[PDB]
């Protein structure tokens, strides 16, 4: 499962991914409602799911 970042995200905690519009994240799992782990540029971290759109 993959998603595309729709909006920039500047991390608030060191375990969160920095997101730029157009990044493609490989989705891992839900940590809590609204926050998922995924991988981006060989880094695993958390990201807010309302920032992305799930791809086909």
């Amino acid at each position: 499962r993959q998603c595309k970042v729709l909006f920039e995200y500047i991390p608030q905690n060191e375990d969160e991914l920095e997101l730029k519009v157009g990044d493609i994240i490989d989705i891992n799992e839900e940590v809590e409602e609204g926050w998922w782990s995924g991988t981006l540029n060989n880094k695993l971290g958390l990201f807010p799911s309302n920032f992305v759109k799930e791809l086909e």
Binding site: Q12, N13, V31, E32, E33, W35, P48, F51
Partner: peptide, 13 residues
Amino acid sequence: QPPVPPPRKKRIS
């Protein structure tokens, strides 16, 4: 409008 990140409570287990 840009989105607001949800609150966090948990680290990855």
